[PDB]
């Protein structure tokens, strides 16, 4: 979801 | 003192709500930008943590979770702060843009917990935290909700977690009368965010009824996350019961 995409950068 | 030094240097800027201060105080003009705001600081949340020292000794889902799960805190706590240093404690100063006074207070329909804001607020004040205290028991605040059935790597976490405590009492150095009132200024941040966190939740629900736009990140940890806690599966770590 958006959050761990978030983190991912 | 490394790490302070470290704090410091990680500490996010400023941030913008993008709110159009030009234009009537709306519910829902005012809790749309809220939510803009709210997913703007959750990005500089997430860089901010990540360069934390030891972070990266937890287990990267546990990474994940501590700031899902604390980032309500961490932001009810940064923004009594900035209260505090701009406007002392005056009104909210939820960004340089966003400034609550008691008229949008009410209009947000947030009296309450702006109320219990701005009493937190005021105790930087009656407490004379310093600058490097405030910093400290931020960082601390990131660690101090988990799930009741523990993290992935719960270890990694309690040692953290220690070390984060203990760099709290290296600051403070009467020293027991400092941590004492520290320890329940931090948990008393953790009853605010959960009002919040009610808010918030009920707010994505009926959202669509009253026209208030949720951003994506916001409304997935909002629908995912904050349940968690709000049905009681996470919980703060509280120094002093409560
Ligand atoms: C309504 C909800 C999700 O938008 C929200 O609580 N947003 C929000 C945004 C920013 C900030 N802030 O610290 O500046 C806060 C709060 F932590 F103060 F309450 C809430």
């Known amino acids: ?9 | 003192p490394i790490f302070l030094n470290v704090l410091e240097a990680i500490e996010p800027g400023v941030v913008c709500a993008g709110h159009d201060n030009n234009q009537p105080d709306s519910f829902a003009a005012l809790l749309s930008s809220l939510n803009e705001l709210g997913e703007r600081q959750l990005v500089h949340v997430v860089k901010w943590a990540k360069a934390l020292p030891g972070f990266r000794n937890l287990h990267v889902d546990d990474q994940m979770a501590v700031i899902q799960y604390s980032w309500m805190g961490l932001m009810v706590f940064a923004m009594g702060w900035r209260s505090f240093t701009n406007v002392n404690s005056a009104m909210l100063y939820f960004a340089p843009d966003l400034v609550f006074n008691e008229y949008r207070m009410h209009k947000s329909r947030m009296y309450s917990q702006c109320v219990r804001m701005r009493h937190l607020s005021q105790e930087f004040g009656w407490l004379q935290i310093t600058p490097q205290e405030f910093l400290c028991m931020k960082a601390l605040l990131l660690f101090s909700i988990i799930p009741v059935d523990g993290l992935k790597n719960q270890k990694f976490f309690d040692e953290l977690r220690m070390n984060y405590i203990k760099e709290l009492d290296r600051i403070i150095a009467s020293c027991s009368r400092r941590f004492y009132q520290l320890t329940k200024l931090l948990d008393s941040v953790q009853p605010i965010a959960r009002e919040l966190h009610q808010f918030a939740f009920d707010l994505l629900i009926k959202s669509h009824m009253v026209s208030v736009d949720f951003p994506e990140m916001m409304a997935e940890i909002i629908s995912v996350q904050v349940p968690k806690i709000l049905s009681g599966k996470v919980k703060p770590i509280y120094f002093h019961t409560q």
Do not use: I, K, P
């Open chain 1, 1 to 9: 979801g958006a959050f761990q995409n978030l983190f991912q950068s």
